[PDB]
Design a binder for this molecule. Structure first.
Ligand SMILES: Nc1nc(N)c([N+](=O)[O-])c(=O)[nH]1
Ligand SMILES: Nc1nc(N)c([N+](=O)[O-])c(=O)[nH]1
Lengths: 261, 261
């Protein structure tokens, strides 16, 4: 099904074996400050996520200040947790520093559109980059068709900068630039992203549209997140981006067994 | 999509609105004995399941002794919890007494085959009957094809006894007469049951094949049960039969929103 592996320097992610779990590192910063309390709680969280089945650790971030916060955490996690690190930035300079610090994958919520030079950073360090659907508006003519269009405009920016197809991952950008009904419509029609030929990452964890359906606060969205993860895997996604790693790994693992992955 | 409602005497279940949750009543009997401790813990459990989103209460059971245990519980739950009760029996006499006691739906794990007269009981009291796939062996030529064949032999026994199509529900009998790999194959191919034209109930809650995939004890199968519930709803099932009503209702509810039910 995938004729290649996702190459991440020292680590390699097989795309056929199983749904790969991306753990969302909570990055609660110190008010006083790369301080000991914030980097240690990060390492501890990354270790916990590694222990409960995460395959990648996703680490998110004033641009100079963004780097000062995220760089130390990538250094500490990179050393202490043997897992690929994605950097959750749309800024080119932030991405540069993060891979330099030890990050393996770029996670861009603006799919190379907010700062085109990020794809150029991706191309040079030769790292996988996640291009997420996003726009500064909701004026959809046709949600899915526009989504796939907007995604292609990311692929073109990426390809034009030198990014190899094998380093391109797509993300439907659930919870971004979409109404709650449009988020459900995108979930309903997720399999359409497959025609683009790239691995898909789904990021739905605890998001507002789950709460909109279930009428439940963020800490009560685990079952709703599970439904989205399940439908997502059934519709072909290679990755899920989750806060609840233990639960979602068990769910991903069971989907896999059933769908024949 | 369904041109009729599931009629259950005083209650009516719409088959289009949502995935209907069937709560599994734990029926821990007293060693000393329709005793107060066992009927009260049953009522309390049924009340709890009603509170957390169950649409039907499933109540299970020496044939004379089976009736003595289940009849009082149906009487107490029927009175105290305003929900349809299915009786989980394959015995005709047990089913007769249970509907007489207040049960609304027959839940037969042997699909009218262990005791054909049960369909006759169904036909007379004019109650919906769940015909589950089951056989006394695993000698499948072709799992899905044999399943759909074996299910039709139930529909014929039911129809021949007087059962109206509108009172027939089918169940793929997950965890019955199937290897763990065959259980996964049936989950993978559940949508095939839809060609038979009847509502499908999925019963996968906490079952051995989830533990076989996840390597987890029965009390750790909630995420794995959720995956099966999710795939099941995506594949068209009208009902899920679950122990964890709170969680599975939230999951069913989110699947519904996404798939457009
Ligand atoms: N790829 C990806 N990155 C993110 N930061 C999000 N998010 O919700 O924040 C996401 O959904 N997908
Ligand atoms: N319909 C139905 N009835 C049952 N008793 C079971 N079960 O596992 O015991 C089931 O799965 N389905």
């Amino acid at each position: 099904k995938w004729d290649y592996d996702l190459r991440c320097g020292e680590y390699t992610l097989n795309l056929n074996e199983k749904t790969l779990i991306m753990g969302i590192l909570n990055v609660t910063p110190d008010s006083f400050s790369g301080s000991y309390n914030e980097v240690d709680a990060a390492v501890r969280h990354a270790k916990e996520m590694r222990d409960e089945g995460a395959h990648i650790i996703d680490i998110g971030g004033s641009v100079e200040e963004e780097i000062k916060r995220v760089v130390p955490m990538i250094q500490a996690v990179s050393k202490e947790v043997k897992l690929p690190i994605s950097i959750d930035t749309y800024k080119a300079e932030v991405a540069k520093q993060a891979i330099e610090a030890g990050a393996h994958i770029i996670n861009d919520i603006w799919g190379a559109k907010a700062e085109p030079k990020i794809a150029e950073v991706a191309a040079h360090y030769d790292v996988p980059i996640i291009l997420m659907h996003n726009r500064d508006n909701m004026n959809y003519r046709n949600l899915m068709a526009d989504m796939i269009a907007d995604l292609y405009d990311s692929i073109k920016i990426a390809k034009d900068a030198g990014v190899r197809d094998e380093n391109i991952i797509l993300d439907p950008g659930i919870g971004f630039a979409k109404t709650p009904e449009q988020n459900l419509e995108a979930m309903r029609n997720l399999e359409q992203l497959n025609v683009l030929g790239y691995p898909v990452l789904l990021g739905t964890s605890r998001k507002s549209f789950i709460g909109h359906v279930l009428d439940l606060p963020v800490e009560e969205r685990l079952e709703g997140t599970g439904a989205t993860v399940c439908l997502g895997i059934e519709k072909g996604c290679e990755f899920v981006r989750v806060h609840d790693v233990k639960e979602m790994s068990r769910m991903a693992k069971m989907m896999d067994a059933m769908i024949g992955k």
